[PDB]
């Protein structure tokens, strides 16, 4: 699968998002099962007060003040969480499933798998007709892959745009979610004009799930902040190391085959992406990139 | 399997349809557990007001004003969404199963898959079993090129389905935008029940009126994106005569300057595949020249 | 299962329609007994309310007395009728698999075609083993004496579609006739005064504006169903299903002596070539004395 | 595969029984969900009557009049439906699963199945292993004829079973038709609870009275059809000698003119097997002539 | 393959046991669903009586008179029927899983299954088949030596049947004794005067007319079960099952050197011959020394 | 699951545990379905008595007296039943899944299953490579087990824990069975907020819990009796030393040695299921049989 093409920052978030999502789901459930606002008329030994209100006047007051007193944030806290998590997940898996930049990844993975474990690699890095035929076919495949992928830049622009979009969505969320968080309170006042229906004008209301939504909001800000720090680090990683230019220096130094060229653009990007998992697949691919090795295979074929 | 024949617009529209179904199901789920209407009579220190009504008269009033005061759009918003999503699903994946129509596509897919990995293409672009495989490839290519060139059964149907989807777009957006303002919270109910209840005018509240409005806005936006994608698909479909294909670049980049020009359904399929990866075309075009057949026969000896 | 190739497109279409009809019927029945089925109030023929002075059980007495005295019989038993009609359709669609007289012949035919479809001699004849081919030929010979003796496997297939068409016509008739009798507000005039004190009541049927909509849907479905059946009723009449003629195979193979079969074998070939038009081609070679002449020559 | 020995009636009655069972189960299911009875006292502008009764005295009245005024049929109809259906199913099944009467059936089925695929059967109608298998099957059939052609234990039980089922039909139809008129909607209840409630006469409504009646009618219909088929069986076992079979058609057609006429259990079972496909009879008949055995012996020597 | 060692009576008994179980679960479920007792105070135009009792004093009275007036049989009838059914089931199967009486059964059944597919039996009534027959003969001798002195596979059968019969007698006894105490309306005289104000109440038990019918049905079913078990108990004792004579097989096969088995093996043969009286002949063929001498002669 | 390595003791105790769990679940289900307390005030022609209490003062009274008047046994009986049956099951099952005492069990079962059907047993009591392999695996397993302990002490240690737990359960169930009453009195000091100080309460599941407690006591008693008999059976001879004596006279072989420790322990256990596996194993325990097999192989 696409496990080799995923640094830590691209799997770490792959869990954070999930966590975020479940919070949202929990909220939604608890917003439906649990009760809601409860409102009582205000009058601005001990004996109780008689309001002389029915069982439907109370429901009318409750469901009028629910939407005439509560701030829009308190009413819909978790739906925004679900929307944001869904958009984040859509961002994380954009260039994997987009045609025009998906076949290249599949071909690269297939060729890397083929060349990772080859007898010719063992023979070449140490210092039959079938093996020689397979080796020659794989060299031709590598050459055609190089000429077919070493011209475009689609697998880098998409990734840059993706990270930029995730970072900006971070900034917006931490902006507004932090702005509107003191408006989730417990006891509110409701001043609606229902005087000819119930006989009372001012009410005091208690929102049930206020404290819990406040706690969940703080947890969500924390998780988002971690997400944003990870994304910022990735964005720094992209824009510092000149990711569109590879350099086979260490392979040349500790291999002895001093003719490996420096590939650029998309292939260099993919090499930089695959050496963050296990820095040896670059060696195996570099084996199949020297005219010297091709000449030695031709000579041994005879 | 079939992912190769599904361009980006198709998957984009499928995701939009999935989201549409999700919001429809969300609305349907909420309507059962929360939605209701509460109606009170109108009479046009602080003390309460006595109406002197039972628990049966209140239910009478509620369920009468529900169906005599609410606009039909507010009552059944999400069922329309579900029906439209169902129609959109039916329109998609419809040009696969109207006739059998599976042999014509699976045969082409298998042909292309076996042609892509044929070493003969690589050798031209640079044992007995290889010769037998090449002979079978040529024979089945000939059979399929003879079968396909019969008419238009997998091209016009695509046009019909896209046109139907666009028409459904226009209608849905039109009447969802027209009536989106009939979802209100507080309404006035004027029913003539005075000889059994005593009150004539009532004021009612619909529980879910600030949420159906937002779900409607989200649904309308998703609809608009869907329609824009469909319009682009139609523009691309009708801008280029996809029933005729020319191997202009293949002959120049390969040197075999005798490859013919195929048309109708086969050309349509070739253009369909050209979007995913413009490499299968050359691999198939390798097995389309009689000179290649002559070379294969000569080398098999 | 095994009896899958013996289903033209309209058969699976009608199966899907029938299952959808059953879903609608069960949905309606479930929604029926899920809520309060009626709300009835007495009638008395600044603003202040009216005190009926009725207990909590007198209201239930009134509700369920007027429910079965003011509602039209259609508004109550709609889902039950939907279920009954769907079950009848499903039973009718399969009254040619379970009858032993037709089941035996169908199993024999399917076994013969299964044996013939994977016989190398068919490929040999079409391109232009041994004892098994001869034995299969005698099996085919016996087969086209066992079945070709009358009209049993075909008479019931044309007898059932007529019944289905009649049922669809009757359903349309009495379901469009009585769709406007499902009202929302009704008047109930029962004589319960020594128990309650009120004689005239006004009632609301809660799910009256729902059964209406479902009804429409139901009609539409049967309408489509009807059309399909009509096509099949037309498909069995323009061409004589009891006469078959091997013509294209003769020209595409050259074995120009295959005869024209009649009766149930002809009908079965007609009904099975619409699934995959090659079973007739594969079977055709097992019908000519030339094929057996070549078999005997090859054996010697 | 105990389906070859099942004429059309023995498979029609099974579906009838399933339908009867589902009707009974549906009725028994709604027997509990819906509230049973509603009783109010009788006093033998417009204002209501103040009964001045609690919610406990109402329950007392309802649950006393329920069992002091309703007829036993109106209360126990579904249970009787289920009991009768279970008895019918048990009677239909008391033919395969009785020791001393099940081994013969399986032996016959296995022998007939093996004989249906012997190539000597088709050979006689125009290899060492095949020859010895044919000889062994000849001996097995000869032994079997000496096994189940002495006692009619497998034929008397079928007649007993069908007679009992007909009797049950008669009883069920009789009493259901007699009592179906006692399921009423509105009833009167005259119980002596005056020192506890203050009222002596009550009027009650039985909610599930217009429904059971309908189901009851349906039940009869199904049962009626059931009985008819059983009656047909008690004309098919008695219009000829069911214990004397005649292999006349096989001799007059195939040519083998020495096949014997079996009798008793074997004749009855052949008459039954000849109600599915008249080809098993001749496949078994061909393995009953000494001429065929002599021909096989000559071919073996 | 235990069905062969399962006479007809031990199928009918299993069916009766499952019927008893379904009746019991039926009763328990409908006991859960209902509302149980309803109690009202007694005062030992028409106007209703005001008892001036709260909504919790009714619950107090109802549940006090429940376990102060109802008989112990009317409350725990379903539990008793379930317990009896479980004991019956665990009693009928206590000779398959008890160690020391299970290995013998599996050995015997496996051997009898092996000694059915043998052409030597057909010959009575080639090197590999001869060796297989000799091995089977050696096995016959060895286990016939094995299960010949430990005669515990038939005492357990008699003991379980006796236990079942005794349990039948007890159940019938106290079910007939206490079936007239399931009454509908009862009088409850509890001393609660300073908490409710009333001293005497009259109560109705909801499930007083369904339990009577279920009790009668249970009595009928258990009576049939007991009659079957009584017949089986008579069967085991009118003749010694510990001795078997192979008279008919000897007279029919002319191998008249067959000895008479005894004790446990005689019991197993007596049990098996009542399913299909043919395995005895196969074992008779495969237990004689004449047959093995003939086999040895043929082998050479 | 190792049926042969289970005697009547194990099967009977497993069935008893199943029944125990059944009644425990039944009681817990009824408690969670229909079980509560109903309390009324006390005043220490017939007419009704007015308490003048709301619909929430009753809830308050019921909740307060459900915690100050009901004994902790009356409320938590099914939970204790479930916990104790669970621990019994775990203790009885904690003998095969120990990391280090499992392979010796299934390997022994496989060896004996192979030895049961070996033709050499038939030949002796009346394929050479297979017989040699079986002899080899047998002798290596003997060497491995004769020095490997922690397969006999664990059995005793688990069957002693069951006995002690039985004793404790009897102890605290017999004493607190008379505290499950139906009618109880509740004297809580809530007068300024309810108006009454003394209440009489009914617990709705007193009699049923009494019956279930009696059934539980009987079932434990039987379980403990069986466990005591098992302990007696283990502790009256050297279960770790088996004597191959009758084999010599009833087989003819005179060179059958007596195995030591855990292997003798399993031999003693498996002898009761069927006293014939010892025969098949003793056939292969002779050092002359291997010599005869080697001679016959040539």
mmCIF file of N, CA, C and O in Angstrom, chain A residues 220-251:
data_model
loop_
_atom_site.group_PDB
_atom_site.id
_atom_site.type_symbol
_atom_site.label_atom_id
_atom_site.label_comp_id
_atom_site.label_asym_id
_atom_site.label_seq_id
_atom_site.Cartn_x
_atom_site.Cartn_y
_atom_site.Cartn_z
ATOM 1 N N UNK A 220 -10.829 20.437 21.862
ATOM 2 C CA UNK A 220 -10.708 20.587 20.416
ATOM 3 C C UNK A 220 -9.678 21.645 20.040
ATOM 4 O O UNK A 220 -8.893 21.443 19.108
ATOM 5 N N UNK A 221 -9.657 22.781 20.741
ATOM 6 C CA UNK A 221 -8.590 23.746 20.480
ATOM 7 C C UNK A 221 -7.216 23.127 20.699
ATOM 8 O O UNK A 221 -6.293 23.365 19.912
ATOM 9 N N UNK A 222 -7.050 22.326 21.753
ATOM 10 C CA UNK A 222 -5.740 21.717 21.987
ATOM 11 C C UNK A 222 -5.343 20.787 20.838
ATOM 12 O O UNK A 222 -4.222 20.869 20.303
ATOM 13 N N UNK A 223 -6.257 19.898 20.440
ATOM 14 C CA UNK A 223 -5.942 18.972 19.357
ATOM 15 C C UNK A 223 -5.619 19.733 18.072
ATOM 16 O O UNK A 223 -4.660 19.396 17.362
ATOM 17 N N UNK A 224 -6.394 20.779 17.767
ATOM 18 C CA UNK A 224 -6.128 21.564 16.563
ATOM 19 C C UNK A 224 -4.763 22.224 16.641
ATOM 20 O O UNK A 224 -4.061 22.328 15.631
ATOM 21 N N UNK A 225 -4.377 22.721 17.817
ATOM 22 C CA UNK A 225 -3.090 23.394 17.921
ATOM 23 C C UNK A 225 -1.959 22.423 17.628
ATOM 24 O O UNK A 225 -0.989 22.768 16.938
ATOM 25 N N UNK A 226 -2.068 21.193 18.133
ATOM 26 C CA UNK A 226 -1.048 20.198 17.805
ATOM 27 C C UNK A 226 -1.025 19.947 16.297
ATOM 28 O O UNK A 226 0.048 19.888 15.671
ATOM 29 N N UNK A 227 -2.210 19.796 15.695
ATOM 30 C CA UNK A 227 -2.292 19.600 14.248
ATOM 31 C C UNK A 227 -1.573 20.718 13.503
ATOM 32 O O UNK A 227 -0.807 20.465 12.563
ATOM 33 N N UNK A 228 -1.820 21.962 13.906
ATOM 34 C CA UNK A 228 -1.227 23.090 13.215
ATOM 35 C C UNK A 228 0.277 23.146 13.370
ATOM 36 O O UNK A 228 0.989 23.509 12.434
ATOM 37 N N UNK A 229 0.786 22.810 14.557
ATOM 38 C CA UNK A 229 2.236 22.766 14.717
ATOM 39 C C UNK A 229 2.853 21.735 13.780
ATOM 40 O O UNK A 229 3.873 22.003 13.128
ATOM 41 N N UNK A 230 2.237 20.554 13.681
ATOM 42 C CA UNK A 230 2.753 19.548 12.754
ATOM 43 C C UNK A 230 2.741 20.063 11.318
ATOM 44 O O UNK A 230 3.722 19.901 10.576
ATOM 45 N N UNK A 231 1.638 20.693 10.906
ATOM 46 C CA UNK A 231 1.545 21.188 9.536
ATOM 47 C C UNK A 231 2.569 22.284 9.269
ATOM 48 O O UNK A 231 3.144 22.353 8.177
ATOM 49 N N UNK A 232 2.795 23.164 10.245
ATOM 50 C CA UNK A 232 3.794 24.212 10.076
ATOM 51 C C UNK A 232 5.185 23.619 9.921
ATOM 52 O O UNK A 232 5.981 24.085 9.096
ATOM 53 N N UNK A 233 5.502 22.588 10.709
ATOM 54 C CA UNK A 233 6.795 21.935 10.536
ATOM 55 C C UNK A 233 6.923 21.342 9.142
ATOM 56 O O UNK A 233 7.976 21.462 8.504
ATOM 57 N N UNK A 234 5.869 20.685 8.652
ATOM 58 C CA UNK A 234 5.946 20.133 7.304
ATOM 59 C C UNK A 234 6.172 21.236 6.279
ATOM 60 O O UNK A 234 7.042 21.116 5.408
ATOM 61 N N UNK A 235 5.428 22.336 6.394
ATOM 62 C CA UNK A 235 5.588 23.436 5.448
ATOM 63 C C UNK A 235 7.013 23.967 5.467
ATOM 64 O O UNK A 235 7.575 24.297 4.416
ATOM 65 N N UNK A 236 7.615 24.065 6.654
ATOM 66 C CA UNK A 236 9.023 24.441 6.723
ATOM 67 C C UNK A 236 9.894 23.425 5.997
ATOM 68 O O UNK A 236 10.822 23.796 5.270
ATOM 69 N N UNK A 237 9.610 22.137 6.184
ATOM 70 C CA UNK A 237 10.420 21.103 5.550
ATOM 71 C C UNK A 237 10.383 21.232 4.032
ATOM 72 O O UNK A 237 11.402 21.036 3.361
ATOM 73 N N UNK A 238 9.216 21.560 3.469
ATOM 74 C CA UNK A 238 9.125 21.707 2.018
ATOM 75 C C UNK A 238 9.986 22.841 1.473
ATOM 76 O O UNK A 238 10.597 22.675 0.413
ATOM 77 N N UNK A 239 10.065 23.976 2.165
ATOM 78 C CA UNK A 239 10.523 25.225 1.566
ATOM 79 C C UNK A 239 11.920 25.630 2.035
ATOM 80 O O UNK A 239 12.244 26.820 2.073
ATOM 81 N N UNK A 240 12.764 24.662 2.392
ATOM 82 C CA UNK A 240 14.088 24.982 2.913
ATOM 83 C C UNK A 240 15.194 24.199 2.218
ATOM 84 O O UNK A 240 16.323 24.688 2.096
ATOM 85 N N UNK A 241 14.887 22.989 1.757
ATOM 86 C CA UNK A 241 15.896 22.052 1.282
ATOM 87 C C UNK A 241 15.957 21.943 -0.237
ATOM 88 O O UNK A 241 16.613 21.033 -0.751
ATOM 89 N N UNK A 242 15.307 22.844 -0.967
ATOM 90 C CA UNK A 242 15.311 22.806 -2.427
ATOM 91 C C UNK A 242 14.890 21.421 -2.916
ATOM 92 O O UNK A 242 15.656 20.678 -3.530
ATOM 93 N N UNK A 243 13.635 21.087 -2.623
ATOM 94 C CA UNK A 243 13.133 19.728 -2.779
ATOM 95 C C UNK A 243 13.075 19.270 -4.232
ATOM 96 O O UNK A 243 12.874 18.076 -4.472
ATOM 97 N N UNK A 244 13.241 20.174 -5.200
ATOM 98 C CA UNK A 244 13.177 19.828 -6.615
ATOM 99 C C UNK A 244 14.548 19.534 -7.215
ATOM 100 O O UNK A 244 14.748 19.726 -8.422
ATOM 101 N N UNK A 245 15.502 19.068 -6.412
ATOM 102 C CA UNK A 245 16.841 18.771 -6.910
ATOM 103 C C UNK A 245 17.498 17.760 -5.985
ATOM 104 O O UNK A 245 17.807 18.085 -4.834
ATOM 105 N N UNK A 246 17.718 16.550 -6.483
ATOM 106 C CA UNK A 246 18.344 15.492 -5.708
ATOM 107 C C UNK A 246 19.842 15.473 -6.003
ATOM 108 O O UNK A 246 20.321 16.109 -6.943
ATOM 109 N N UNK A 247 20.591 14.740 -5.179
ATOM 110 C CA UNK A 247 22.046 14.695 -5.319
ATOM 111 C C UNK A 247 22.547 13.343 -4.832
ATOM 112 O O UNK A 247 22.516 13.067 -3.629
ATOM 113 N N UNK A 248 23.014 12.510 -5.762
ATOM 114 C CA UNK A 248 23.584 11.203 -5.425
ATOM 115 C C UNK A 248 25.071 11.361 -5.107
ATOM 116 O O UNK A 248 25.956 11.029 -5.897
ATOM 117 N N UNK A 249 25.335 11.883 -3.911
ATOM 118 C CA UNK A 249 26.706 12.074 -3.451
ATOM 119 C C UNK A 249 27.162 10.943 -2.535
ATOM 120 O O UNK A 249 28.221 10.350 -2.760
ATOM 121 N N UNK A 250 26.378 10.637 -1.500
ATOM 122 C CA UNK A 250 26.763 9.574 -0.577
ATOM 123 C C UNK A 250 26.785 8.218 -1.271
ATOM 124 O O UNK A 250 27.652 7.382 -0.985
ATOM 125 N N UNK A 251 25.838 7.974 -2.178
ATOM 126 C CA UNK A 251 25.846 6.718 -2.922
ATOM 127 C C UNK A 251 27.120 6.610 -3.747
ATOM 128 O O UNK A 251 27.780 5.565 -3.764
#
